[PDB]
Design a protein around this ligand. Structure first.
Ligand SMILES: OC[C@H]1O[C@H](O[C@H]2[C@H](O)[C@@H](O)[C@@H](O[C@H]3[C@H](O)[C@@H](O)[C@@H](O[C@H]4[C@H](O)[C@@H](O)[C@@H](O)O[C@@H]4CO)O[C@@H]3CO)O[C@@H]2CO)[C@H](O)[C@@H](O)[C@@H]1O
Ligand code: CA
Ligand code: CA
Ligand code: CA
Ligand code: CA
Ligand code: CA
Length: 1055
């Protein structure tokens, strides 16, 4: 433009160091940005440092310990500001600094100047900035160069940025090929688009509520966003004299959606078999170039095809021969990445990959419909359990499982199928026969921990050593062991398993040697939960016998087929769309963020950094093209792999609307698909309505309930130390069998029982019960740590559980909490009593694999990387993996003392207890499915039929008494054998007698009668007059038999 100002640096040299510290000295410069804008020489007499020694930093020699002393004035100064020479007692360590003008802080942050990061002890700072810089030049270019990324190009014409508020020059500079910066003289010569102040739209406000308080700026209606977005984009502000105010990078995901998403959403992505051949398509609306690289089976480039860019969508496409089926491929990108600030060139696998090479290095063209990739009969495979009505869904009884947890240890699984999808076909193995038994008794669904492509297992078998293999193999592949306390064992000729067993002997809270070795094993074994997504829509390769190419696809479907057809269970998949394993332009597992940088990840609105609140690299499902990729992904798992439902990890990091959108999309494919998820944190309500327990009321989207879970288990997931033992649950005898440490009051115990009863009636917000004080309360009025307790509209929106893959197993919680006088048999009943609140409740029942086997992880709280050793499940029923070493010290170190106290209170369960627990478990699940009354499905039907006795301040503590009405009132006899059901769970050491049903013709269920001495109700007595005496630690299911007509049943009372 002819006129208008040239934005430029301050006309002054980039400063050097004023002085350098000598011995026993440190030096601090204050780079006076405002006085570098010159005119008069500023005066620095009022500048002073406050300097003091504490315990973290003690290197100062003459620190003044009086805040009102402003005498530590600059040693000298020049045009760039003052500096201080600080005497020291030493040259290592650190010093504490506060920079002041008088007693006012110019930097409102205690400065830790550590001579480790700063070898020459000569640092610089700027006012209003907590950063400690290496040199005055660095600090100067921080102030007068591009920093952060707080500008937000949110649609075509709207740009939000605080740094340009009320300032004369505000513009959007850009360079196709290089990083915007001042030129040889000192001016910003690059092209720009001028910005005018404006007011945020109602659509920008609705779209980005967490930004609607940013100062808004308008772009020319004719601006060419295609060209701007090709390279680095940098918003700049400047004074009247053209001096640079601030300059920041731009986040563009808003405008990318405004510009391209409408067109890009109508397209299909990945390597797609058609009639004419194969269409490749990838979305890369900012890339300068995309070439499709075709690879031979041995990974030699055999063709390279520049792709065609569609300017409306920003998608790139290429069409080739149908002979490309089976070919490996990547996308060679030429694309600017805001994090590196450079135009990167790298090859990336397809985010829409549906097949992969070993370890996910290349994607592969595949037609998932090929009969070659299907087990015989696949096309006719049906769901063994219905999921159509709410009553169908309430029957769901989930068994949460992991591919290695299932088979890694089962000697009766062929050695080569161990830890593999195909282990589920080993029809005579202990593991599969055990699962068949569980299914026959009423476990209806297997939920699989991550079986999409995860990043954290090396699928090259030659770089892996598992504990069943020689210890010398572990030394080969894990160079770290050779320099470790176990190095002597490389010669042993014994397996790692055999070694770890020997380490149990001397293992203790002082000598945690089992865990010490296992930490090394964990680095290079085959084991991980897998919450670490590499590709969302390919199976994991390490669980295939052959991870190269398409074999894993047929092996996966063969597993799926055996579960439905041979075990008789539906399959749920854990999915993890809330984060990616990595982001940025360099990491091997950064896929989405290499192709469309800063679009698929959720970013800090100020720094532009990829957030990590999930654990890892947070994703952005509020962005339209990630929403599409999620829905497309689930479509494949639904249709091509016949997955019956999905559990979303950290679902509350997703918009409610996005999750409902994905659900309507998938229901168009199969109406019976069930969606549910877990969540507690997020802190994303500022950006959108999150998909949380509270917000999902009425949607039919299920959520894990932590209410009954914590009431029955006791305590909470963040307890540590003695609190693990004091915070007894209903299942472990809160109030009624106190241990030596607890101070649980009767009121507290009765509070837990309110939460438990609420959960057994499906945790509905509007269920009305009598609370711990005899007060009438709606479910939402029962407190849960501040939140409303009951939150749902139907029991099918609530997933009850008392054990899960994450946090301590149920058995380990009982071991922490059970009084010394509870013997081994009483603790087994505690496990069953605990599980009974889930299995006999109206919420969907969920449980961890092996709870029927008293599963233990040796007190490990978080076993995601704790290997075969601590996650062992022994389907030969020799033990429950209890007491196999102290858990990992890095996470449970603070628990070693309480563990040592409690650990050896009773014997370790052996085969007798394991068989007894399993019978108890099957008894519970056979009861759950013995009557429609347990699984009403609909929350209004729950309210009209479900009540509780033994409530109020004078209840018998720990006795849970639920009634389910099948009588003349409420409605019709959904159950032709009974007019009502009584569920009684006597979680207490005393025998108890019920009088609430005197004269009523009550009788024990046939299932519990059949089990005889093995029943949870063994010893129950029903007297002639209908009074019922319940043993200690018992579970009893009673029914009023039904006559030629429908009896009066157990009418609910209007409270
Ligand atoms: O070597 C001693 C300590 O020196 C430094 O502490 C400084 C602070 O940085 C100054 O800000 C100030 O502290 C004020 C404080 O800001 C003021 O609010 C008030 O503190 C209140 C406090 O708000 C309130 O929560 C409650 O605790 O009452 C306090 C007073 O009892 O008063 C303070 C005194 O001026 O001055 C101190 C000087 O000691 C340095 O930051 C420390 O790390 C260091 O240990
Ligand atoms: Ca230096
Ligand atoms: Ca993998
Ligand atoms: Ca591992
Ligand atoms: Ca935020
Ligand atoms: Ca009936």
């Amino acid at each position: 433009d002819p006129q208008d100002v040239v934005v430029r640096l301050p006309d002054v040299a980039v400063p050097g160091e004023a002085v350098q510290a000598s011995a026993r000295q440190a030096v601090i410069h204050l780079v006076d940005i405002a006085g570098i804008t010159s005119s008069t020489p500023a005066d620095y007499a009022t500048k002073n440092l406050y300097l003091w020694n504490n315990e973290t930093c003690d290197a100062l020699s003459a620190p003044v310990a009086d805040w009102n002393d402003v005498s530590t004035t600059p040693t000298g100064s020049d045009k760039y500001g003052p500096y201080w020479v600080i005497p020291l007692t030493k040259e290592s360590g650190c010093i504490n600094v506060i920079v002041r003008d008088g007693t006012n802080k110019l930097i409102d942050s205690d400065l830790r100047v550590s001579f480790s990061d700063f070898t020459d002890r000569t640092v610089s700072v700027i006012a209003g900035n907590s950063a400690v810089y290496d040199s005055r030049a660095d600090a100067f270019r921080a102030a007068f160069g591009v920093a952060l990324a707080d500008a937000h190009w949110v649609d075509k014409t709207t740009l939000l940025w605080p740094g340009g508020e009320n300032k004369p020059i505000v513009r959007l500079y850009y360079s196709h090929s290089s990083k915007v910066a001042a030129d040889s003289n000192g001016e910003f010569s690059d092209k720009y688009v001028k910005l005018t102040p404006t007011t945020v739209n109602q659509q920008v406000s609705m779209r980005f509520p967490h930004l609607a308080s940013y100062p808004a700026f308008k772009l020319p209606d004719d601006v060419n966003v295609d060209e701007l977005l090709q390279g680095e984009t940098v918003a700049i502000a400047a004074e009247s004299d053209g001096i640079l105010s601030s300059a920041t990078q731009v986040q563009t995901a808003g405008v990318l959606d405004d510009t391209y998403a409408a067109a890009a959403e109508a397209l299909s992505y990945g390597a797609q078999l058609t009639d004419s051949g194969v269409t490749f398509r990838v979305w890369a609306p900012t890339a300068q170039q995309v070439e499709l690289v075709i690879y031979s089976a041995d990974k030699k480039v055999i063709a390279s095809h520049p792709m065609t860019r569609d300017s409306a969508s920003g998608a790139w496409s290429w069409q080739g021969g149908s002979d490309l089926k089976g070919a490996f491929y990547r996308y060679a990108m030429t694309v600017y990445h805001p994090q590196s600030r450079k135009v990167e060139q790298y090859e990336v696998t397809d985010p829409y990959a549906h097949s992969l090479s070993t370890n996910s290095e290349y994607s592969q063209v595949v037609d998932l419909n090929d009969s070659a990739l299907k087990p015989e009969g696949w096309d006719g495979l049906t769901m063994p359990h219905a999921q159509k009505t709410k009553a169908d869904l309430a029957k769901m009884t989930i068994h949460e499982s992991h591919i290695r947890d299932l088979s890694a240890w089962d000697q009766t699984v062929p050695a080569e199928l161990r830890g593999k999808y195909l282990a589920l076909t080993a029809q005579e193995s202990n593991m599969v026969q055990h699962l068949k038994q569980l299914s026959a008794s009423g476990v209806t669904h297997i939920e699989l921990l991550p079986v999409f492509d995860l990043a954290t297992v090396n699928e090259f078998s030659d770089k892996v050593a598992d504990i069943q293999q020689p210890f010398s193999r572990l030394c080969e592949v894990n160079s770290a062991v050779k320099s470790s306390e176990f190095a002597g064992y490389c010669d042993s000729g014994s397996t790692v398993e055999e070694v770890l067993t020997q380490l149990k002997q001397n293992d203790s809270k002082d000598n945690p040697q089992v865990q010490a070795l296992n930490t090394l094993v964990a680095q290079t074994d085959s084991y991980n939960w897998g919450y670490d997504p590499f590709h969302y829509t390919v199976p994991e390769g390490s669980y295939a016998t052959d991870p190269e190419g398409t074999a894993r696809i047929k092996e996966f479907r063969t597993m799926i087929q055996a579960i439905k057809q041979d075990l008789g269970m539906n399959v749920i998949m854990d999915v993890v769309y809330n984060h990616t394993n990595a982001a940025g332009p360099t990491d091997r597992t950064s896929v989405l963020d290499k192709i469309v940088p800063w679009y698929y990840q959720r970013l800090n609105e100020t720094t532009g950094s990829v957030e990590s609140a999930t654990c890892c690299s947070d994703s952005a499902p509020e962005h339209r093209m990630f929403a599409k990729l999620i829905a497309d992904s689930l479509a494949v798992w639904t249709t091509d792999y016949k997955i019956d439902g999905f559990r979303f990890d950290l679902m509350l990091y997703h918009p409610k609307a996005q999750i409902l959108s994905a659900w309507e999309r998938i229901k168009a494919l199969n109406p019976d698909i069930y969606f549910f998820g877990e969540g507690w944190d997020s802190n994303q309500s500022d950006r959108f309505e999150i998909a949380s327990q509270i917000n999902l009321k009425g949607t039919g989207i299920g959520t894990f309930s932590d209410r009954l879970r914590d009431a029955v288990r006791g305590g909470g997931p963040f307890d540590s130390g003695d609190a693990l033992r004091q915070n007894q649950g209903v299942g472990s005898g809160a109030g009624v069998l106190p241990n030596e440490l607890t101070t649980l009051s009767d009121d507290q115990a009765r509070h837990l029982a309110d939460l438990t009863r609420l959960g057994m009636a499906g945790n509905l917000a509007d269920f009305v019960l009598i609370d711990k004080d005899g007060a009438v309360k709606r479910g939402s009025e029962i407190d849960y740590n501040g939140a409303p307790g009951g939150y749902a509209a139907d029991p099918t929106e609530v997933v009850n559980y008392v054990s899960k893959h994450d946090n301590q197993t149920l058995w380990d919680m009982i071991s922490y909490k059970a009084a010394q006088e509870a013997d081994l048999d009483t603790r087994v009943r505690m496990q069953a009593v605990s599980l009974a609140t889930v299995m006999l409740g109206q919420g969907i029942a969920f449980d961890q694999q092996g709870s029927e086997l008293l599963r233990s992880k040796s007190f490990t709280r978080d076993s995601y990387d704790s290997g075969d050793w601590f996650n062992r499940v022994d389907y030969s029923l020799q033990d429950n993996n209890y007491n196999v070493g102290m858990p990992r010290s890095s996470d449970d170190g603070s628990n070693y003392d309480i563990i040592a106290r409690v650990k050896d209170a009773v014997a370790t369960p052996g085969e007798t207890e394991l068989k007894q627990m399993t019978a108890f478990y099957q008894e519970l699940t056979a009861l759950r499915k013995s009557s429609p009354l347990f699984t009403l499905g609909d929350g209004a039907t729950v309210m009209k039929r479900v009540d509780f006795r033994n409530t109020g301040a004078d209840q018998q503590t720990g006795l849970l008494v639920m009634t389910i009405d099948d009588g003349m009132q409420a409605g019709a006899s959904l159950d032709s054998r009974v007019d009502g059901i009584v569920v009684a769970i006597n979680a207490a050491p005393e025998s108890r007698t019920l009088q609430d049903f005197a004269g009523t013709s009550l009788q024990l269920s046939a299932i519990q009668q059949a089990a005889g001495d093995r029943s949870l109700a063994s010893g129950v007595q029903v007297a002639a007059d209908g009074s019922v005496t319940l043993p200690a630690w018992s579970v009893a299911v009673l029914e009023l038999p039904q006559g030629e007509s429908q009896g009066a049943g157990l009418p609910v009372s209007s409270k």
